[model samples]
Structures are given as structure tokens and as C-alpha cells.
Target: SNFGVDFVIHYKVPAAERDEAEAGFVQLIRALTTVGLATEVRHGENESLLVFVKVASPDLFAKQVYRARLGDWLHGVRVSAPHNDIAQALQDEPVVEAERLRLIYLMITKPHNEGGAGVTPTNAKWKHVESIFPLHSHSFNKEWIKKWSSKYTLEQTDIDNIRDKFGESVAFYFAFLRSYFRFLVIPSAFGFGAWLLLGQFSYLYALLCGLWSVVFFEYWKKQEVDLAVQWGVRGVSIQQSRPEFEWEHEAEDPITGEPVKVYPPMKRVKTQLLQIPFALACVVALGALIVTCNSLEVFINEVYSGPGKQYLGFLPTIFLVIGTPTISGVLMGAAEKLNAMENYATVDAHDAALIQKQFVLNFMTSYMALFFTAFVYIPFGHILHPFLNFWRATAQTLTFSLPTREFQINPARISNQMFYFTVTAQIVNFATEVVVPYIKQQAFQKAHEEEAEFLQRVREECTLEEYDVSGDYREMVMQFGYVAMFSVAWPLAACCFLVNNWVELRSDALKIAISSRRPIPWRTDSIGPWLTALSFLSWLGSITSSAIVYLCSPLKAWGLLLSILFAEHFYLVVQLAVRFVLSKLSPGLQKERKERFQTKKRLPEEMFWQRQRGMQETIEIGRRMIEQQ
Candidate 1:
């Protein structure tokens, strides 16, 4: 019953602004009734109001629109009709104001010739009011949640539904998360078991984990392509222009009617090139800060045994906790401006560039400590600790010593670090991202409800925009980088990560649904450059995993250079094996493609005859007209 009755308009106006809100409401209703939609009003939960809108007789509305579409198609005004219902289409019950919202939005949003209200979202006439879109109704969401929750799997149909509501770009991210989470279960469960039995340095475990990363990366590429094409969002932006896109100057194009903002490819390329030096500066400056902090941490935790040893141990971590977000925000702001200066014509192009820059910043902050711990410090800390001890001696008396059994660096700490990052860190991150913001949104919404009408406007006028989830996506990207870089050290990292993401997916959905505004729907075929980043991480993972195993192996007598040299060649073989194995894997999208081909074949003759009939009618009309003249 809660299925396809989707045409409704849900509008909210602040209680303090109710007079103006009422004015806007009458104005909109007047505009809507111009085409023919009856509107009913009601008070909303907060300091706002709602309206119920629906057609007097939807079948009549649908029929008139269909004929309009048919005429438009015949005259080349529109290429195709969205629905084949050229006759009266079955209409659903429009009981409530949510119904009113969708009806108003759809009617007003359509072209003037199709008999819609012809209003836009950004009209200044509706300035005091906010939010104009169809609600993703409570009943529909309840059923959707129940269906996917019970199954614990998202299908292509689910992806399609999301795209229809939120658009393909948002769907692409969700699809990636779902597919990536599903793939993680295999490695995660296996890695956990491997850690329990084989220990950190097991050769078989390292090889398999690396193999899994490489294989998963390749498989997802195929899956991404298939999913994009299946959703019909492939190549979504052939010449897509942005609605809010600012231009340097508009110039008419040759053989093109629409004016364009021309930024030469090479000009943008030169602007982007400035990032090389900027990137270098971040690595040196931020990298040094990280090293210094980490070194102090090691020095205090391992070397110093003073009166406040335990207390001092917390400072490095405290510094890091505050520092990570601070540095990340500061650097990302700079990157955003740099990307903006590059002046991409499309949002996707700009975002892709920005996300790539974020990948660099993410790498520096999220993984640098781990990078130093695994690749640099753990393997060669013995040589470096002495210099650190010497530097400390100059400041205050210090000597570094370990028991004969303990040796230079304890290998056990590697596993502990993985646990801290994968389990503890994830929990803290969730609290910051999800729990905190939700409380704030709820608190404000609640406050507004209780406030007097006069007070509502007198207080700080805070309005929520549609949710932007780019931050959550970037967090997953960084998390994956950690898993890729260090999963070999403790095989359970992926396992713990897998557990985190399952909860994360739901948490994010709730945040979008309840805490934040419905996102501005965007259509995209891929998760942008993040896939390239993922693949890069996997290739790097292979080498890092192999190197870790070689370093910790009982086979060190075989020589370090020899170990690295052998691992490099082995990494290539692993990649090649991954390709060979995937080639032999059964194709999942094959059946769908075949079905489409068969459908095309079945309708071939019908299309040819339809075209012939049109041609015949045109010829007969011309002949009659010519003879009459």
C-alpha cells in the first residue's frame, strides 16, 4: 500500500516567519492552482507548518500530460516520455500534505507547456521558507529498512531505488560501501583466524592477504562498470553543466546553442601542477611534526622511567588526537581552494580533483605513524634509538637498555598497534561523526519547537542544508589505507574493520535520514578517484605485507636486500595470479546483458514498422497538400 504513491510536497516555514510563510504558501498555492492542484494546510511538528497537495483527478492529469509528452516527442521538443502511459495512468491516493508537497513540486517543476507550476528551488520569492521536495515517506522507509535489514544484503534493485531517490552519485558511494564490506568479510574472517593460529609473521597468511587485496581491487573495477551500466548512469556527464557553476566569462560555442565557460585543458593542468610543491611541503613539514611527536612518545614510553612516566605518556597521544583533526582540516581547506582555483567546469571534475588531494592529506595524517612504525621504525629502530638516546642525554640524563630476552624492539607491539587503530580508533571516530552531530541536531530542533514565535527569529537563525556525506566517504578511504598498509602485521585488522563498517553503514543511513536534510541528488557512474586510490593502496599493500613478513620471518639469515628483491618479483606474480583467477571466475552480470540483448532483438521489427508508418503518413500528407495547392 505504501509503494508508488510518490507525488507529494512537504514545505516548512519558521514559526516566527509564519506571516511570511503564510504569504509564500498562498503564493505557491496560487501558482500551483494555475495548472490545477488542490492544496490543504496543517501545522508541522516544530515552529513550522505543512501543506497537503494532490491532483483533483490524477488519471485526468496523467492523460493530459501523456498527450503533451507525445506531442513534444513528435515535434522534437522532448526526446522521450518517462512513462509509456499515453492513456490515463493509474493514480494513487494523496491522503496527506506530504502528498501535497510532492504534487506541488512535480507540477510546478515541469515545463510550462506540460502544465506544471514552473517554479525553481532557488526562487527568491520563497526566501523566508526552506526545503521543497518529496519526503522519502516513513512507511516506505520502514518497509525498505525491514527488507534489507533481514536479508543483510543489498541488491541491484536496492541500488536502483537509492539512485531514483538520492541520485546515482550517492548510490555509487553506498554501493561501493556495501560491496566493499561484503568483500571484506572473507579476508577479515580469514585474517582473524590466521592471527589466532599462525601468528603475525606467517608466510602463508601474508601471501593470502596480499592476494585477497589485489583480487578484490580488480573484481570491484568490473563490478563498478557493471553496476553503473545497470543503473543506466554510465557516462552521466557528457556535457553536464552545473546550476550554481560560476564562470569566468560565457562564450558561445561553434555548432552549440548553449553558452559555455571555456577553460583550456592545459591551463587547468598548469594550475594543478602547483600541487606538486604544495604536496612536497606537507610531507616535509607535517611529516617532521609527526616524527617528532612519535619519537617523543617512544622515548617516554620505552626509555624514560621518571616519576611522571605514565602521565607523560598520555601527552604524545593527546597531542596526536587533537593534532590529527586540526592538521587535516587546515590542510584540506588549502587543498579545496587549490582545486577551486584550477576551475573545473563540472562538479564531478572538481570533486575528483579535491578527493585526490584529500587522499594525499589522508595518507600523511592517518597512515604516516603506521607507515613509520612498520616500514621504518620497527625494522630499523635499533639503529635510530641510539641517536634518540643521545639527544635525550644532552637534555637530561638517559640511557636505553633492554633485557637479553627482550632484544631491541618488541615484535608484540605491532599486533597491539593494529588493535588500537582498527578497534579502539574506530569506536572513537564513530562517536565524533555520528553521535555528537545527532545530539546537536536534535537539541536544536527540540529548542525551536518550545521557543515562542517572536523568540524563534530573535535567536540565531540556524537552518540546515541537505546533508553532504563527502566526509564519511573520505573517512572510509583513510580507514582502508590503514588496513591495507598494516593488515599483514596483525591479520585481524581487516576482521575488526569489517565489523565496524557493518555498523557504520546503518549509522550513516540514520544520520542522513533523521539527523540531516535529504541530500541534493547527484548522478554519477563511479565513486570517482577513490577507486583509483583503493587500487593504489592494494598494490602498495602487497609490497608492505610481503616486506613485513620478510622482516619478521625466522629467515633473516637469508639477507634483507635478497628478501626485498625476492618480494618485489613475488608481488608481480601475485598480481598476475589475481588476474588469471578472476578471468576464470563466473560472470555475475552476464545474464542481465543477455536479457537486454534478447529484448532488443524481440522489438526490432516493431520499431522498423512504426518508423515506416510515420514515413507513410508524412508522404500522404505532403502529396495531399501538394495536389491541393
Candidate 2:
């Protein structure tokens, strides 16, 4: 019975905005009705309304699904057209929950001019509308959580089940994580051997790690396309224009002969040029802070040996905790503004552009500390002699004579840092990601159990946060960076990562199942910009791993540079070779191609016969006309 509830709309009727809220609610109801949706109003807490919605007519919904599939064929997202009869088509390929809900959401959100309600919650006109979301099916959630917990590893069927419920956008995250988890086994085994036998900073381990990163990246590229084809959304890149987009003029599309809203590329380019400064600002702002804290950390831990030295050691971490998010928040706002100015035509393009800028910021913040340790602190410890002296002079000036110790570089520091990142940080991440949310949800449920089960579930779901798949992707990708770039310092990084991901695979399922509101079932063929980020990390890892191994060993400046140069070129050559080999391997889309080919072949034969009959009739008619002449 709970599965019957397709979606819920949270309508706010604040006391201060009573009149406008009432009018907007009326309009919203009318729009939903016009779109063939059954809406029921229920009382909600704090002067709010919960509007329960589902399809009013099954036949109508079936038609809409058929039309949607046809549109996919027209746009080349699908290889072949759907069955001519809607009923038969539906019978052949039943509508999955995600696909059904996605189409309904589109109907609700599309413009009124385009035969939709045009309810933009972010717009001032729909300010009374707080949220529109699908309700969770508790039955499925329980079963999914139970089944996954019992299993050691997820199968393709499990991923297919996820796609059926959550859509490809979310499914791809799990798919990527699963593939990554499996790939980690090789490195984990290899790294363990290196740790026991070769010890830290082994050149052989660096070479092997570089090779593994390249292979995994290239393999995932093939895997995603295969999944896309299997899911029947291989070319699914169609996106609607964002409501916030400002168009300069309407112009005719040269290819389609349709009018399109045009934005000048040169103008967008001019705005995009601002990203250079934005990136520089990120480096300057984040770089300076990280460097300052790092310097302070070295000064306190290595140089100062005073009464409160132990307590003072935490100051750098304290500053980073308080300051990183503060600075990152401001930078993120600027990224959003710059992305808006670029004036992309589609929502996907706009989002992709925004994510690119965010990646740059994430890259700097995530790896900067490690970069400082590996490149600056380890090889060039003497360069920090002056900074240590500055700290010494400041301490002397600020207070009475303090006990000072001779400064020495710690080669073990990088390993310790890697241990924290791989072991301690992962535990904290898992706790926050899974345990915290589960406890919080349980407490909320206890407090709200007084209401009827259906009403209670709806209300609780409303309070739950929306899930963003991108956040999970960012987490996994960053973890990959640690393993690829700095794992040589701590050979067990891959082993630790492998264990965490086994839990991550299931925990993320639990997150979607219970912790967060059901996400919008957006269709995507691939992981989008994160793939590019992974490729970049893999290439950089080749250079960094080689340098770390060389620098840690007794080597000259020229030798270090030469080693880096050789490693990078080797990476490039191997990347091309791997790509070439993967290309020759079958993508497993042969069945789909064969089906499409058959469809085309049959259609052309029928058309040719029809033309032949008409031609014969026309020739006979022409003969009679000639005889009369």
C-alpha cells in the first residue's frame, strides 16, 4: 500500500504570507489536475500541506511512457523505436519505478508554456512551495538493506535492482564504487607484499601502483559505455534549459530548422576567462593558509619544547578545522556565480562547468598537505630553516625565554599522515556517513511515532535531506587519489581502502534506503566530469610516485628531475597502449547493434516493395495516356 504513493509536495502556508500561499496552493492543485495527476491534501505540521500525488489514469500514463520512449528514439538516445501499440510496448518492457517517477517529475516541473505546471520552487512566484519529492517505499528499503548486509559482494543483479528503483544517475555511483572496490584487490595484495618485503618507498611498488591506476581508469571507461548500452540509454544527453537561464535572442537551429535561444559563445568564453583568476585565488587563498599552518606545525612540533608545547601542537589543526570550510564556502559561492555567467544552454552543461571549478578547489585542498610533505618538506627541509627562525624570534619576543630545541626533519611524518588519512579519517568518515544518520533518524522516528503510520512516514521523509550522488563520487575519487599518489609512503593504504569500500558499498545503499529522501531519477550515461578528474589523478600519480621514491632515496637534483621525466613519458606511452588494447576488446554492445541493424534492414525492404507496386501502377497509367495521345 505504501508503494502506491508516488510523490509528495510540501506546500507552505506561513501565517505571514497567508494570502499568497493560499493562491499559490490553488494554482498548484489546478496545474497538477491539468496534467492528469490525482492529488489529495492532508494536514501537515506548522501550517503546511502535504499533497499526495499519483497517476489518475493508467492508460494515460502508459501513453505518456510510450511517447517518452519514442522521443528517446528520435533523439538517438535509444537505438530503435518503441512498439507501435502502447499496451504491447509496456507489456514487453514494463515501466520501472524510476522511469515512471522521472517522467512524472518532468511533467510537474516543465514550463506551463510547454504543457506543464511550471512550478519553480526557487522562483518568487512559487516561494510558498518548500519541496517536491518522492516518498520512500519502506518495504523495499528493509528488504534491500537486509539482503545487501547478508551478501559479501554485490552482483550485477543488485546494481540492476538499484537502477530499477533509484535510476541510472544513482546506480552509476554504486557501479563505479563496486568496480573500484574489485580493482583495489590487486593493489591491496601487491601493497601488502611490498610492505612486508620491500618496505616503504619501494621503486617496484610505485611502478606497479602506476600500472594499476592506468588499467582501472581505462577499464571503467569501457564498463560505463557497456552499462549505458545495456540500460538502453547509451546516448542520453538531452537536457532541458534551466529556468534561471537568460537568453540573448531566439535564432534558427541550422541542423534541425527549429528556433533556439542563442547565447554568444564569445561572450561565454569571456566569462569563462575569469576561471583563471578564480583558480589562482583558490591556490593563493587555500595554499597560503595550508602553508602557514604547516609552518606553524613544524615550528611547534620540531622547534618549540616549552611548558605548553604539547597543547600548542593542536593549534594548526584547530585553525584548519575552523578556517577550511569558511574559506571554501566563500570560494564555492564565487564558483556558482562564475558558472551562471557562462550562460550554458542546458542544465547538464551548466552543472558540468560548475563541477569542473569545484574539482580544482577540491584538488588543491585535498592533496596540498601531502604535496607539501612529499615535495617541499621531505626533499627541501633546509628551505624551511628561515621560517623556523622567524617562529623562534617571535616566540622570544612574545614571551619570557622559552626552551628551544634543534630542528630536524622527520621522514616518518608522511607515513604517519598517510596512516591517519587511510585508517583514522576513513573510520570517522564511515561514522558520519552511516552511523550518525542512522541514530539521528531513529531518534526522530521515536518522537514522531504518535501519528498514523502512513502520515508519520510522509512527515519523516519530508524532514530527511535530499541525497546528492556527486558527494559520494567526490569522496571515492579523492580516496583513489590518496592510493594513487601517496600510497608508496604507506604500502597498506590500498588494504585499508579495500576494507572501507566493502562497507562503503553497503553503507551507501543504507544511506539511500533510509537516511536520505529519494533522489530525482535523472538519467545519465556516465559519471560525467569525475572521469576526467580520475584520469588527471592517474597521470599525476605516475609523476608524484616516481619523485617520492627517488627523493626519499639518496639522489641528486638532476637525477630527480630525470626520473620524473622518464616516469611521465612512460605513463603517456602506457596510457596510449592500454587505450588501444581496450578499444580492440569487445564492448559487449554487439546484441544491441545487431537488433538496430535488423530493424533498419527490415524497414528498408518493406519500403522498397511498397515503392515497386506504386511504380508499376504509375507506368501502366502513363502507357494508357500515351495511347490516347
Candidate 3:
């Protein structure tokens, strides 16, 4: 069978709640039909039903697409209005799959009052609805992976293909990673030379890395704008109001003369202020856990010469592996609660706010261990003395008396830590990202064999998880942080990252293709809050790199302070200069602006002539009518 499927809705038919499930399923089908979607229900494994959906009416879908384009123009997302004829408008600018799926999703999920089906899976009324997702195009996936694998490097066309298939949100990530991968060539080469000639903790290498980070970030800022314009998604921030958004009142838009839901910014800000405590809570909880573990690690490796030293060394790692996530999960829950309380108007705003909070948690968890090693253990090893004493006393109380060894701060610990982050962690991550999922999916496919090709694919797809671009973005941003903030200690970090990303680009593609459901192709103008995260990391790198170099080297406290001061000032100067230079070279944006201006200039002339012709025709008709009477 051709399948001819656009989206899938997983409906649950619980054994116990058979009546409610059946009723909800019926309501769901009615809602989808109301939204002009054709649904075909099929048997799903273990008390579930699979609802395959597609646009029932092509003409209606075309009109919806045309109206959406016109709405975009009205909201300044598009430079010009769509053609008055729906067919002509589509011919002028065809809607990509991403845009098509997004609108359909909106249709399915939006409230009935908003001309949608109002099928919210989270709501009690639609509780039986498990998930709504799109199926991956296996044909496209096969070609995509094959083409990318055969190629040595990605060009704009490759990224454009991704945008056409997956959507800009996923495309932007590939674009960013490709750009970042290319940029890494410089550092990778420089790092190799430094490892050979200048060695670790070289001030010159740190300076170059800092400057390189600034240049890359500034360029990417301009680059994303260019991509946005190229994709015609620039200024595409207009979004539907979130379903859960509780508006205080309806108010008329002063400029557009349209009614809009209103919520007080002051009230939102009041709730947003709670993020400070949430962040503090993350720091204290995660921080204490990391410190305690680090102290144990230090005691086992440096201070204690115990019989089970090898086994004891694993204690810190085990504790962190278990404790970190437990604490992070609680913090993440708190973050979600705080974000909901903030009451953002649109889904985009809500997701962005949540990501910002998650970034804080990730920052502490990912970097705190390295920070303790570089700054606290290396520079202020004495500060951990109390923790060491506590551990020593605890061991004595346990009756496992062990002899204490000399406590010497190992400077190589940071480099070792960076090695794990840059190399080992990346390997394990890749396995989980691609290999594990592939194996799992294959096993699942074998167990649930279907005679028909179409059903087999759908069944396999149902087992796959939903892909979130944010997770990939977080991984890359954290990797970038390692290269920026701590690469001075291990100059080979950039080289490792360069290699990993090359594979990462393809592995992530495979991930989306095989391991996860085709994402709901959200359109994003840029990398969203991650651009800010990148800028922050780059800025912090300068100070941290300088301090690490100076402090780790045989240097004085006064000298370290002075190096940091000068380094920060230099970073600011370089940042300003880079921004200024990049501002001058945006030909893509310049051309887009010119086109918009021309459109604005041409509309009035056409309108005037059209009005004149209408007037003349009206007069001619009136003369004819009078003579006939």
C-alpha cells in the first residue's frame, strides 16, 4: 500500500475504562472530522488504537494554506500578501511539509472556539489520546543518510534539503553544527600545534581560543539572520495563544482593530521572579552533592591508601550518576511548575522560558565538577580539608582503618576531566543516540512482524519516541562550553570535538530518521535562546581561560588577577570589533530588505489604477441601467 498518511494519533483503549475510552475515541474522531481530516482506525498493540489522518479536502486545505500565508503577511512575517487566488498563491510560494504539518497540528489541537478540534491529550476530556505525531518518510530518510554519508562536508544545499524535509527548527541545528564544525578546523589545527610546540596552559593558545570563540559567535549571530531571510522565516514570531494561557480579559488591538486576549505583564513578571530561588535551589542541591562526591574522590585518590582503593574510587562516580539525575529531576519539576506559573501568552514564549531554566540546571550539573577541579581543588585545595577530615572520621567510625597518604593537589585532574567530557562521554553519547536506538527498533520490528508493509512501518513508528531538537541543542552547547571554558587545560579538546561533530551530524540524522518520530516541524528563525547561551559561554571563556592558564601555571595571585582583568577587557574590545565588521557584510539581509521595500512601493500604484477602473465600470453600468429602464 502507498500508505498516503500525513499524521498519526495514538488512542488508548484501556481495559478497565473501556466505556470512557470508547466515548473519548468517538469524540476524537468527531473532532478530527470537524477539522476536515480523514481518519482510518487500525488495531494497535496492547489495548491501543492507531488513527491515521490526512487532509480530506484538497481545496479546503489550499484555502487554509492561503489564509495562513495572508495572515503571515499581515503579521509582518511575510513581506508581501499572498495572491488573491489560492492556487496562484500556492504556485508563487509553495508550502513546505513543515508548514503544512504545523498548520494541521494547530487545527487538531487548537480550541473549537479558534476553529480547531480542541483535542488536547493532557486534558481530562481527551485523556485517552496518548500522542499525536507525524510518520517519517522512509524514502527521504534513506536518501538523506546516504547522501550525507557519501559527502565530506555539508553545504547550504544540504542544510536546505534538511529544512525542506524536517523543518527549520531541526535544520537550524544542523546548520549551527555544520558552521560550528567548520569553525572548529581552526582551533583543531591550532590546538595540535600548541600541543606539539607551546604545550598546555599556554597563555597564547588561551588568547587565540578566546578570540576565536568571540568571532564564531558574532558570525553565527549574523549567519542565522541570513538563514532566516533565505528561508523566508525572518520575523516569524507570530504564534497562537497557548491553550492553557489564562487571560484576564479580552482587549482590542489598537493598531489592528482586532480583539486579543490580554494578560498583565506585571503579573507574569511576579511569577518569573520565582526563577531566582529555583536557580539557587539547583545550585545548592547539585552543588552540595558534587562537592561531597568530589571530596570523596579526592580522599580516595589522594589522601587515603586503602585496601579497596580501586573500588572506593568508583564511589564518587556512582553517587554522581545516581544522585545528579534524581536532584535534577526534582529541579526540572520545579522549573516546569515555575514556568507554568509565569503564564506565557504563546507556546514559543512558554518553551523558551522553560529552556532558559533548564539551561541553568544543565550548566551547574555539567560544569560544576570541572569548576571544582580547576578552581577549588587546584587553587584552594585547603578549603576541602574539612570535608576530607569528615570522610576520614567517618571511615574510622566504620572500623575500616586505613592509612592516610600525603594530600597533594594534582593539577592533571582538570585535563583528565576534560578528556572524559570531550572524548569518552561523546563516545557513550553517540552509542545511546544512534546504536542503542537502532538495535531497540530492530528488535521491536522483529517481535511485531506485520504481513503488510504499510502497517509494519506504522507499528514500528509508534514505538519510536518523539524527537526534541532542544536536546541536541543542549548537547552541542555544552560541548561548546567545554571547548571555550576549559580547553586551555587540554589543548586537544577542539580536535576531539571536531571529529565528534562530523559523526554527530550524521548520527543525529540517523536518530531522527530511525530512532524517533518525525518531529512536528516547527519553524524557528534562529537557534532561539541558545544564541544567548553561546554568547554567555564565549564571554565566560575569556575570564576562565585566562584564570586557568595563570593560576595553573607557576604564577602569583596578583598576576592572575591582572591577567583576568586584561583578558576580559580584551574580550570586550574584540567582541565589539567583530560585531562591527560582521554588521557590514549581510548581503542576504540587504537584498531581502530591498525586496520588501519594493513591494511596499509598488502596492499603492496598483491599488490606485484598480480603484479607477472600478469607478469607471460602475458609472458605465449605471448609464446602461437608466437607458434600459
Candidate 4:
């Protein structure tokens, strides 16, 4: 039950001054709701507020949000309402304020079929109204917590107990071997050899890798859909906030009377430009780290350490190389903080920004690492050997040699390292995540049984609602497993990942029932633009893996300088081509959107609807479809 209103009036200023408009309007609201103008709480640090104006009743709260006198600063505005019954109550008020109603009607309104306002409020009391349009970014996990505590006793959530019920086998490792044999080993071995024996310029290896990556991405795409469906968290973005959202004006929506955030248009678009600097900063910071780390490794083995030194011998370079990612993380975090500064309205955008910053930073770093590994590290001892020798003559003694018998790790070593770290460790990480949380909860519960019961009783007395949930270890484990293989881990763990996920996919369902609460249904429209980033990462991994392999190989040291430059350019081109093709070939996300709108717009005026009705239902449906996929 949000604000217990039937509708809201949403307005857009669409400019920086709109921020002021929102402040002013909110000021008006606080004035009307029991508080004198002087009694207003400080607007947000950025001049926003969450004024809980309790008027005489639900009817009063509705007017309290909509009641207005001053401020023509708001340029564009509209409304969205959730409940049908309360919306009808707002009808007389809207007509009484016909000019205002007409102004509200001027804003964009579409049917739910096409991702817009479809005006039907079903069974919603004044307490349960939330806007269907101008959706707020909602967290399923947060919401699930709220909905479930209403129903279940939740007396104990201990990991030990959950493990006792579920058994702690980490059951998918051996099963991973099956996927390794069937999907990964045969093709990779042959492919690796073909690439190694031939050159990178050869079509066979690059083509094979590209096709493999595409297939993997596609498979993962299917996999994500499947898991989300099983977990029932598809299409969860409707609850997110618009970037420019401001709270001030609320009114009975001409259609759906749901409280809506009003912000100016210019503000949102302006905030978007933050990405340009963000992307640049990400590249520079990550690239610089890669460069310095590689430079150290090169100086160490070739110039500073190998033979003539004792204490400083190769150690400094090695230490720094080990510490590179850690250092990069500091910069990555800063970049993420900057990204977050744009004032995102939803956690989805926040999470997406976080993922995107990490991904791009990783890509840039990997790119530089590979470049330096080829042109600098592997060939460093050779290309800069002369320079280092010159320095040695000035300082001390520096000696270097490249023998005919240089050592190299074969594909088997790489394959093994990947399997161990990415696959095995990742699965272990998932198990730990789930088990640890459950264990912590149980320990807390056991220690505080009385406290737990007290909270439970209070919840029961207050809200009598029930929600389904999987109260177990397995489902929790699966929740974070997929991200485990998102990086350099995928190549090593794909087969195992595929296999484990297959079992995990179903087992999680059982665990959900036994151990956790069912998630609130959500609707997501595609991965909501983040898929663009994921695709970019896959392609990046390709270029990165290839370049790294090229640079790491002793044989390629002779042509290091040229290879690094060429690989970078090639990667850029491939990324461009991939994005172009994808954008053109797969416009289905918005296509169905248009058709749905056309259908809804054709409906009779009497059938006019408010926005986002059945959104959760649609998202849940989407979730189910993805799981089946």
C-alpha cells in the first residue's frame, strides 16, 4: 500500500531548472500537508524529499499530493494511477479541474499492450496503488523479503539445517567432466592446435573462436532466460525510476491515479552524457595499469633482475603484476562511483552501470596486457635488451639471453588452470555463498529464538499476506553461480558450467520450495539494454584471449610490436561490425512493443486503460519462458 492514492500527476520540466521546479512543487506539497512552509524537511542533498504527508484519510492523501497553487515552472507533466476503483473516485475531481485534466491528457499515454498506460485497476484498494507507468525500479529480492515475511514464520534459516535437508555435495563437479568431454575438450584441443600451428591471421582459428564465442554467448543467453524463468524474476525493470524523476506534483491521474515521479527532460538527457567521460576514464585507468604492470614485468626479467641481482631480482615486477588487478579495482571503483553519481532511479541501472564499468575496464586492461605481453613482455627481453644493456653499461652489469630451448605451457596447462580456478573454484564459491548465508542466519536464529519469534508475531499481527519462496541452500547457490564464469573463467568452465547449471537449474526449484520464499513476479523487457554490454564482453574476450596467446608465445616475440597493434585494430573492427549486425538483425525487442501498442490504441475509448497493468504478470510470464528456453 503506497500513499493509498488512486492516481498521481506526473510532470516533466526536461531541463536543469526542472530540479528547481520539483523543489518548489514539493515545497507546495509540504505546505498543504499539516506543515507550515517553515516546517519543511531539508530537500535532498540534491534538493529532493520524501515528505509523508498524512492528511485526514486516503482521500486527503490523494489531494495532498495533487493540491497545488503556485509554480508554472514545470513545463511538461502527466499522471499514472494503479487502482481502477480509486481512479474512478478521482474522476469528479479531474472534471472539476478540466483544464488541468486536459493538460494531463496532453502527455503521452499508451496502452499496457505496448508498454504504456492501460486503464484497468483490478482489486486494488487505496492502500495498494502504485503507478503502472513511469515505473519505479524495484528490487525483486527486496520486494520478496517484504512479501514473504508476511506469510511464513521464518523461525530458522540456518545453513547447517538447510545443508542437513539438502546435503552438501556440491554435486556438479564430476558432472562437469561430462560437459567438458562432450562440448569443450574435443573442439578446443583441435582448435587450439590449429591456431597455434597456423598463425592468428589464418581463418581457421579466428573463425573457430568467433563461432565458438557466438555459440557460447547464445547458449548463455538461453541459459540466463532459463534460470530467470525458474527463479521467476523475468521482466523486473518496470519498477525502476526514471533518471530525471522528481517528486512534487501528484494528482489523480486522468487515467490511472498512481503517484508518479516528475522530473524535467533536459536533466535526464544531460545526465546521460556522463557516460562519455565515464567510458574514457575506465579505458585510461585500466589501460594505464596494464601498461605499468607489463612494463615492470619486462624491466624485471630483462633489465633489473634475472641474473645479476639478488634481492630485487624479478621480484618487484612479479609483485606488481600480481597486484595489478587489485590496483585496477581501486580505479574501477572510482569509475563506478562516478557512474553512480548520475543519480540513477533504479537499482537495475545501478547494477548495470557497475557491471558495465567493470567489464569495460577489464576489457581495456586485458587489451593492454595482451598488447604489452606481445610487444613488450615476451619480446621485452629481446626488443629492449639493447636499451637495457646500454643502461647496464652505465649502472652495473645486465645480462640476458634467449636460448633455443625456452619453456612454454601447452593448452593442457591453460585448460587445467581455467578448470580449476574458473570452474571448480567458482562452483565452490557459489556453494559457499549460499551455505554461508544460510548458516549465518541459522546461527543468529538459534541464538535469538525469542527475538525471532517476537518479530514473527509482530509481522503476523500487522500484515496477513503470504508469498511462496524457496527456503533452502541450493537455490541460493544457483543465484550467483552464473556470474562466476562471466570472465576468463568461461573458456575453462563452459562444459562444466553447462553441466552444473543444467542440474542446478532444476535442483534450485526444489530448494526454493524447501528453504526460501517465492519471488514476486516481475517483468523485464529483454536484459534491458545490458545485453549490448554482455555481447561486447564476449567479443572482447575473444580478441583478448587471442592477443594474449599471441604475445605469450615465445615464437611470436619476433613480431611482437606489429602483432599487438594489429590485434587491437582488428578487435576494434570486429566489435563495430558485431554491434552493427546485432542492432540491425535483432530489433524484435521494440518490434513486439510497437505491435502491442497498435493493438491497444485500437481499443474503444470506453476501454481506455492506465499504464503498467499486469506488468508483474507479464514479467513473470517472461521469466517462465526464459527458464523453458
Which 10 residues in a row give candidate 2 its minimum summed lDDT? 448-457
Query: Across residues 1-629, which tens digit of lDDT does each residue of candidate 3 receive?
Result: 33678888888777997888888888887877777888888888778998889988888898888888787777776555577776577776677878898888888787687767678876667797888888777677788888989999777888887888778888888888899899989999989999999877898888898899998887887788778877778766466676677888999987789898888788777777767777777889988888888888888788876587787779888888888887888888988876777777878887889899899888888888888888877877678878889988998998854578767787778878888888889989888877877887688778735546777677777887788888999999998988899988998888888989999888888777767887777877778899899889888888999988876774577898899899999888988898888766676767768877888798787886775367779798789889999
Q: Rate the local accuracy (lDDT) of all candidates.
A: 0.66, 0.85, 0.82, 0.41
Please write out the lDDT profile of model 2 over residues 555-575, one tens digit for every residue: 577988898898888888888
TM-score sort, best first: 2, 3, 1, 4
Cα-based TM-score, every candidate: 0.71, 0.92, 0.91, 0.42
Candidate 1, 521-624: lDDT as tens digits: 54566777877887787677667767777765533655766766666677779888878876777333574456557656868878867753677798997898
Candidate maximizing lDDT: 2
Local distance difference test, candidate 2: 0.85
Number of the top TM-score candidate? 2
Model 1 earns a TM-score of: 0.71
lDDT of 3: 0.82
What are the clashing pairs of model 3? none
Task: Give candidate 1 misplaced runs (Cα > 4 Å).
Answer: 1-85, 88-136, 152-166, 238-240, 243-261, 386-408, 442-465, 554-562, 573-629
Q: List the residue pairs that clash in candidate 2.
A: none
Cα error, residue 256 of model 3, in Å, equals: 1.7
